[PDB]
Design a protein around this ligand. Structure first.
Ligand SMILES: CN(C)c1ncc(Cl)c(Nc2ccc3c(c2)CC(=O)N3)n1
Ligand SMILES: CN(C)c1ncc(Cl)c(Nc2ccc3c(c2)CC(=O)N3)n1
Ligand SMILES: [Cl-]
Ligand SMILES: [Cl-]
Lengths: 123, 4, 123, 4
């Protein structure tokens, strides 16, 4: 086409979606990870994760307001990944890299799994 | 704005 | 912080949100523009438009599944702007620039209003 | 991936 493009549009959209999350505006699901609860937007979860994409395209699960993750999933690892979904920023540290990689493999977040594998290989 |  | 960043994350998120829109997945509102109907995600509309942000943060309007725009709003201008919201791409042409600018001013999409003003000034 |  003959379209023009606004370079910062996608980043600005994501920034506003994170502002809505921080204010709990139009969140439509709670993700339960052991004792911890995380509120989010189903559409953002699907856009970032192969696991959530599969869950919320399911004709029955699409209507659930609560999703319980596998008890092996670490709440901190999930928190770091949820923050990444809404910001593009990953808080990857020596002390959390194993929990982050395991959570990203479960959530099917291929690019995060790739950077965790590379950072582990370097050490 | 750019030409993509 | 000591975060790393995935450059393409915001663009990839927006691409997936547009895929959900094209398949009518988790759309939660219909925007009525004269005789025309447009399905969308309230969160994406809010993230892109000052008008939708104000509408869906309203304690009563946040629950509406149908929003009717002012009858002066042109359906094609709205369609071009809705496409821009989900893609960062604006189909700005000589034949639509006046309707696009008027719709962007009504929707409170400041960056689109700015490029329309500049393109009109050049001609 | 980059250092932002
Ligand atoms: C694959 N597909 C057509 C599609 N459409 C819409 C959405 Cl929201 C979606 N999201 C999704 C699926 C798989 C994966 C991701 C997002 C991230 C990832 O690493 N794998 N994937
Ligand atoms: C202003 N603010 C705190 C905020 N938080 C969340 C959202 Cl979704 C939002 N969106 C919004 C508001 C105003 C405008 C836009 C989006 C685009 C624009 O030109 N003006 N604005
Ligand atoms: Cl990823
Ligand atoms: Cl804009």
């Amino acid at each position: 086409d003959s379209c023009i493009q606004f370079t910062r549009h996608a980043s600005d959209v994501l920034l506003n979606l994170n502002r809505l999350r921080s204010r709990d505006i139009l969140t439509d699901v709670v993700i339960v990870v052991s004792r911890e609860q995380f509120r989010a937007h189903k559409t953002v979860l699907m856009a970032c994760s192969g696991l959530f994409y599969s869950i919320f395209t399911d004709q029955l699960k699409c209507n659930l307001s609560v999703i319980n993750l596998d008890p092996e999933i670490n709440p901190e690892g999930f928190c770091i990944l949820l923050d990444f979904m809404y910001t593009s920023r990953l808080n990857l540290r020596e002390g959390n890299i194993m929990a982050v990689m395991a959570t990203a493999m479960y959530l099917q977040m291929e690019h995060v799994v790739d950077t965790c594998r590379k950072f582990i290989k370097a050490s | 704005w750019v030409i993509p």
